[PDB]
Each structure stands twice: as structure tokens, then as C-alpha cells.
Amino acid sequence: LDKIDLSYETTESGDTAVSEDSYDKYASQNTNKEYVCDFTDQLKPTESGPKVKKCEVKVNEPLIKVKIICPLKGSVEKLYDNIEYVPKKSPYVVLTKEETKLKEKLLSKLIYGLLISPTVNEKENNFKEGVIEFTLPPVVHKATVFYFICDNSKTEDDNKKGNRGIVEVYVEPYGN
């Protein structure tokens, strides 16, 4: 409902306590005009979990559509049973850094001009439908970094545990 929980705090690692030098950093699969972070096969429980899979969306051009896919509880039996997504009101609410901590922010006021359709292919633009999308504005005046979380690390199967997914969107100034 476009509200923010100003009391919500987290970190990039969350409860995994994984150091940043141990993140699996990779770039988004960019189709030139759509930068996609697809977690559909990145977070399944393994004996080596939890890992931090961090998809980096680097934007320096105008009107880029950002798409983020986070597996849904029940999409596969058991594999995503305790998956959580943050912020729950994404893409309207996003996370940004307050020094070490991550705090909920309205993307409306963080990047003015940014386009969020209420629907993505006829379904609500919310992680509860599996996908969020937002198209960045034609002008960005300052460098801006915000975050989404798709965390499956609390899903476990015997000695297997899922992975914590992070989307880091790094927007360089363009336009002006």
C-alpha cells in the first residue's frame, strides 16, 4: 500500500553471517533494454548452503526496465517452503544503506520519475506473484543504490539449506 516500515532493519548478509568476499557476485542477464535478475534456479537448498547469490544491476542509460524473479513458496514442493522476500511491498518500497544497515525506502522518492505499473502481465506487481518490474526514469541526477532480498536460507532439508538472494541496483547518473 506504498507505506514504509521505518522500524525494519536488515543487512546484506542477514542472518547468514556470510562475509562479502564470499558472495557469489554476478551481473544481471541484460537484454539491452531489460535487466533481469532471475533467482528461479539460484536458491535451492544444498549441503553447501547458505550461499549469498548477489545479482548486480548496473544502470547508466535511460528507461531501463528492471525485472526480478523470486521463486514462490510452493512453486516446487519443499524447496522454497520458508522463502521470504524483502521489502514485502516491492517494488514500491526498496532497501538502502544506512551505514551498515538496510532500511526501507520508497522508490517513488528515492528516484523521482521512475515507472511502476500496478500490474506485470495482468497480475499484481508484487513478489507474491513471483515477479516485480520497474522502469527507471529518463533522468537520474545522483548515483543511487537500492536493494531487494529473495532469501531462501531458512528453507532446510536435513543437512541442506537454501541460499539468500540479493539484488543490488547501482544507478549511475545519466541525462542531465
Epitope: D15, T16, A17, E47, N82, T155, E156, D158, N159
Partner: single-chain antibody, 233 residues
Framework: TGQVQLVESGGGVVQPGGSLRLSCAAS????????MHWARQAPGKGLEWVAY????????FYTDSAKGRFTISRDNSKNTLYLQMDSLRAEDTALYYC????????????????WGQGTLVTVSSEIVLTQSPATLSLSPGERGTLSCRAS??????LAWYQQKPGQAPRLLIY???NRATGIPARFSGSGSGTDFTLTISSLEPEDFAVYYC??????????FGGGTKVEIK
């Protein structure tokens, strides 16, 4: 439940190279929903994890010393756990506990959240957790602080146990910070990665006991610290 019960049997005195079949009658919970552990405490020593069986009995894990000698099995229609022990050796002398796993609804596997009283077996002749100090002399009312240091990142998957004299271990804290149900609030946990702490805000006379940390981040094997004894000055 508040009526959970585990009753081990089948122990006894055997010579090296002999066999024993341990049994554990499970009561008070949905046995078929929970993985089960065997653990053991050698005379005068700390806690060691032995074996784990999946809720449906289709996957089993073992400590290296038990591989090829011990077989963990279960009958979900008899709510009974078994440990077939073959080719026994003098170092297998220990009190053998059956323990119920903490895991349910896809979270908690590796923690031993309830222990039976145990059955003694006498054979008549890895992530490392460091607990310091080994002994802690304190007075009733003082704040006790126990430390656990892991050889590598165990995330926040560290549990704490209390073994009062003569008694089975009891889960106090799981995943670093989460007090188990029924545990008084004077017990608190903190830490992440490699360094962890258990705080007992005001020691009560019953709190003077041995305490063990345990990791479920990477297993098998499930590993315990050496234990910290909290004595009266």
C-alpha cells in the same frame, strides 16, 4: 509436546568385536515427522554426535568412527529408533542417548532438542568448536558468560546445551539467539560467524552444570564443543 519422552534400552557389557542393538521407545510427539539422532558421552568426557536418520528413514548420516559398524534405523509404526552396533571397540564405551531432532516444517535440522536418559554401553578392554574457559567458578547471583569459538564460519547455526549432574543434556539456545520453549529468560545467546556467547544473567543454583555448544551449519558430522563447567567458588 510437554509430554515428550525417550527411553533407551539394549545396552550392556560386551567384549571388543561384539555386537549390541540399542532401541529407543519414542513417546509424546509425532515420531514419523521428526528425524532422530544417536549421541553418546564417554565416561568423564563431553558430548559426541553418532548418527542421524531422516524422518521417513530413507537417509542416514554417521560419524566417521561409526561408518561400517553402526546402523541407525527406525520403525515409524512402532515409534522406535534402533542403533545396531557391530564390531565394537573399547573406545565405544559411553552412555548412548537417543535424541529427537529440532527440525520441523523445513527448519532446524541438526539440533538435538530432546534427549533421553541414555543407556550405558561398556566394551571391556570437521568444524571444531572450542569452549573457553573449560571451568568457570562463580557464585549464585553472578552473571555467567560462556564462549564458543568455531574453526570456520558456522553462520548463526550454533546451539547451547545444559547437562546438570547426572542428567541428559537439554537444549537452551538454538541458532545463536533463539531461546527454546520453556527455557527461562536468564539464558540468552549472541554471536555470529566464529564467535558465540551464552549469558546466564543471574546464576541460580541449578544453573551450576556443564554447558556445550553445537553447530548444525555443515554436517555430517554434527560437532560439539568440549564443554564449560560452571562451578561454585
Amino acid at each position: 509436546t510437554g509430554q515428550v519422552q525417550l527411553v533407551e534400552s539394549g545396552g550392556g557389557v560386551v567384549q571388543p568385536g561384539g555386537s549390541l542393538r540399542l532401541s529407543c521407545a519414542a513417546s509424546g510427539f509425532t515420531f514419523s515427522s521428526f528425524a532422530m539422532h544417536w549421541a553418546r558421552q564417554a565416561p568423564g568426557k563431553g558430548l559426541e554426535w553418532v548418527a542421524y536418520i531422516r524422518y521417513d528413514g530413507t537417509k542416514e548420516f554417521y560419524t566417521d568412527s561409526a561408518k561400517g559398524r553402526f546402523t541407525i534405523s527406525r520403525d515409524n509404526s512402532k515409534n522406535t529408533l534402533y542403533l545396531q552396533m557391530d564390531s565394537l571397540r573399547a573406545e565405544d564405551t559411553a552412555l548412548y542417548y537417543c535424541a529427537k531432532d529440532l527440525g520441523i516444517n523445513s527448519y532446524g535440522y541438526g539440533g538435538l532438542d530432546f534427549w533421553g536418559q541414555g543407556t550405558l554401553v561398556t566394551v571391556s578392554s570437521e568444524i571444531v568448536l572450542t569452549q573457553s574457559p573449560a571451568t568457570l567458578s562463580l557464585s549464585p547471583g553472578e552473571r555467567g558468560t560462556l564462549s564458543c569459538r568455531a574453526s570456520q564460519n558456522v553462520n548463526r547455526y550454533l546451539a547451547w546445551y545444559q547437562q546438570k549432574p547426572g542428567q541428559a543434556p537439554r537444549l537452551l539456545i538454538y541458532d545463536a539467539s533463539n531461546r527454546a520453549t520453556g527455557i527461562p529468560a536468564r539464558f540468552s545467546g549472541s554471536g555470529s560467524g566464529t564467535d558465540f556467547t551464552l549469558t546466564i544473567s543471574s546464576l541460580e543454583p541449578e544453573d551450576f552444570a556443564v554447558y556445550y555448544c553445537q553447530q548444525r551449519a555443515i554436517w555430517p558430522p554434527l560437532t560439539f564443543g568440549g564443554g564449560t563447567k560452571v562451578e561454585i567458588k
